[PDB]
């Protein structure tokens, strides 16, 4: 059975000093993750996924319309830990190679800072904000930001449940509504028929999630509260999160090609 694993640097017992109190990290990971695994175990209690990894379940149950509920828990248990793992105990200085490459794709570190933070609040819903590494067969290693909804997988193999745009406030009668609507139908029809919309290299090497940001309610609703009057809230949570990013690990997981 899938069991909980300790966090990176004892965040469960002590928790990050200036980001999340130990009581919050306790309810965020030790209690919630345990709840998800308890539900996940019961779903794969007697199936082939009884010994498979969360990521292996995410890719295997991505398109299956009958295993969508199993994908949520598997995709949620993965993204949740993917977020806490990248957090560092203390501030880390951004690497030269990483810092120099970010400026080529976003212009400056402050541009990417306000983009991910802004994208989180602009979503007005639970999900995850990712910093993806886009590398096509011939194109250079280009970075970009992707915002997933409740339980969305940024991996290319799980493109069936990316959940980027809400189909409630993005499909209407306006020019942008019609355009978004066609895409929503073009994907569903193609996906159902099996046709591939965008080519992807084998092995799912096109996109490699480097950094993540958990914007769910349970993560910050206790530490920073609702955020009435601008004091605290989801906005402050995202801002404070920018001070504990393990840029060292983020740089390693990027695996940028030597271009300096």
């Amino acid at each position: 059975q899938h069991y909980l694993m300790p966090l990176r640097d004892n965040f469960e017992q002590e928790g990050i000093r200036n980001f999340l109190s130990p009581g919050s990290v306790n309810m965020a990971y030790t209690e919630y993750q345990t709840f998800i695994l308890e539900k996940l175990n019961a779903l794969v209690v007697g199936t082939d996924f009884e010994q498979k990894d969360t990521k292996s379940i995410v890719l295997a149950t991505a398109r299956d319309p009958e295993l969508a509920h199993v994908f949520n828990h598997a995709s949620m248990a993965h993204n949740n830990h993917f977020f806490f793992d990248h957090l560092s105990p203390v501030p880390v200085k951004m690497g030269d190679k990483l810092f120099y490459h970010i400026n080529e794709n976003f212009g400056s570190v402050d541009t990417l800072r306000d983009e991910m933070i802004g994208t989180a609040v602009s979503m007005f819903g639970p999900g995850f904000v990712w910093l993806v590494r886009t590398q096509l067969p011939g194109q250079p290693v280009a970075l970009r930001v992707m915002a997933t909804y409740l339980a969305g997988s940024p991996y290319p193999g799980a493109h069936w449940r990316r959940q980027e745009m809400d189909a409630q406030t993005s499909i209407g009668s306006s020019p942008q509504g019609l355009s978004n609507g066609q895409r929503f139908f073009e994907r569903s029809a193609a996906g159902f028929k099996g046709n591939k919309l965008e080519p992807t290299a084998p092995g799912g090497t096109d996109l490699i999630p480097i950094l993540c940001l958990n914007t769910w309610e349970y993560a910050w609703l206790r530490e920073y509260g609702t955020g009435v009057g601008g004091m605290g809230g989801k906005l402050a949570y995202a801002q404070s999160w920018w001070n504990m990013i393990d840029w060292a690990k983020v740089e390693e997981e990027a695996r940028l090609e030597t271009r300096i």
Partner: protein, 372 residues
């Protein structure tokens, strides 16, 4: 007291296999086929699975590993074992998708099972504390017997003349002594009624005179007698003077363990259009056209009657793949024999075109292009 080796076997997984239940009941006085048998109404053997890592080796937790020819390649690994080791020293197995996926299809319709209704539709759930009950006590009278579904006695109108003789002689005849005691317990209560009522404003009752005489008073009123005999043998009521006993009680649970949903009173919220009117349609085959005084259609592996109304009139060899029409499943129930009968009702036009929008088959899309 059991040895440790005998304790592990008791809790093992192969020892948990359920016995092969008898096949779905059919007409006893009829002809059948011996050298060929098609799929059964409901499954009789347990469907097994295995890990994809163990399927490449043929290991299904059986006596021996199965062959890889007829066991690998398919998406859903399913198999039924009729004999773990036959006189040929081989595991007599067969593919179990015939019934394994038929359950997944029906559960994809998202419809519960409701008690049959005689012809004001009232779709009542099957799993309820009032109806779904098997335990009882000698205090419950006939008024509560209509709720039960699992009776101990047989349905008289269903049994054959020979099966009825065996019941009368070997199950009913050797019960007179015990039944006479059953009357005494009742007579003992009647005498207590007057005593109790008179006290506000029990007698042992062991006396052959009252019992023998008590039965002579009911000969003129045979109705009240049947209610007393049925309570002693636990027979399913037949005469209305009610619990849908015209065809007899079910040979299994009213749901047959196929769908555990209780209500269909919900509205699937479509992403763009919003809450729809009815449930999404389901494409159905056309079998045995009218030109038989009724047409059959295949809805999710099951065979049901066509809607009360072309494709149903005459056969058309030119139609590739056979005639297929969209339809909505209105009601589903389990008859006495155990069959799953569906009340297939004709579907609307807008629903079909809406269901195709997410598939890419709609000729003209309803979104954007549709001017009116």
């Amino acid at each position: 007291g059991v040895s440790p080796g005998g304790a592990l076997l008791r809790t093992s997984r192969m020892f948990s296999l359920p016995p092969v239940i008898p096949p779905p009941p059919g007409n006893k006085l009829q002809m059948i086929s011996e050298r060929a048998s098609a799929t059964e109404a409901y499954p009789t053997h347990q469907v097994l699975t295995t890990f994809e890592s163990s399927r490449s080796r043929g290991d299904w937790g059986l006596k021996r590993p199965l062959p890889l020819k007829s066991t690998t390649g398919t998406t859903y690994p399913m198999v039924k074992v009729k004999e773990m080791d036959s006189l040929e020293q081989i595991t007599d197995f067969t593919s179990g998708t015939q019934h394994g996926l038929t359950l997944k299809k029906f559960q994809a319709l998202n419809i519960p099972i409701s008690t049959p209704s005689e012809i004001r539709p009232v779709q009542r759930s099957v799993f309820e504390a009032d109806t779904d009950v098997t335990a009882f006590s000698p205090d419950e009278q006939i008024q509560e017997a209509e709720k039960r579904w699992k009776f101990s006695g047989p349905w008289l109108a269903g049994m054959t003349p020979g099966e009825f003789k065996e019941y009368l002689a070997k199950t009913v005849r050797p019960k007179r002594a015990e039944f006479r005691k059953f009357i005494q317990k009742k007579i003992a209560a009647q005498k207590t009624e007057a005593a109790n009522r008179e006290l506000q404003e029990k007698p042992e009752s062991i006396t052959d005179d009252e019992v023998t005489e008590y039965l002579r008073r009911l000969r003129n009123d045979n109705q009240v007698l049947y209610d007393l005999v049925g309570q002693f043998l636990d027979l399913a009521p037949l005469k209305p003077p009610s619990p849908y006993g015209g065809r007899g009680p079910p040979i299994t649970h009213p749901s047959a363990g196929i769908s555990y949903l209780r209500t269909a009173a919900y509205l699937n919220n479509h992403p763009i259009y919003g809450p729809q009117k009815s449930h999404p349609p389901v494409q159905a085959r056309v079998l045995k056209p009218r030109r038989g005084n009724d047409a059959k259609i295949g809805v999710a592996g099951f065979v049901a009657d066509g809607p009360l109304g072309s494709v149903m009139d005459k056969f058309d060899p030119s139609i590739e793949g056979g005639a297929k029409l969209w339809v909505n499943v209105d009601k589903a129930t389990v008859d006495s024999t155990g069959r799953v009968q569906l009340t297939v009702s004709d579907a609307k036009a807008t629903d079909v075109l809406i269901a195709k929008e997410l598939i890419g088959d709609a000729r003209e899309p309803i979104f954007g292009s549709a001017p009116k």
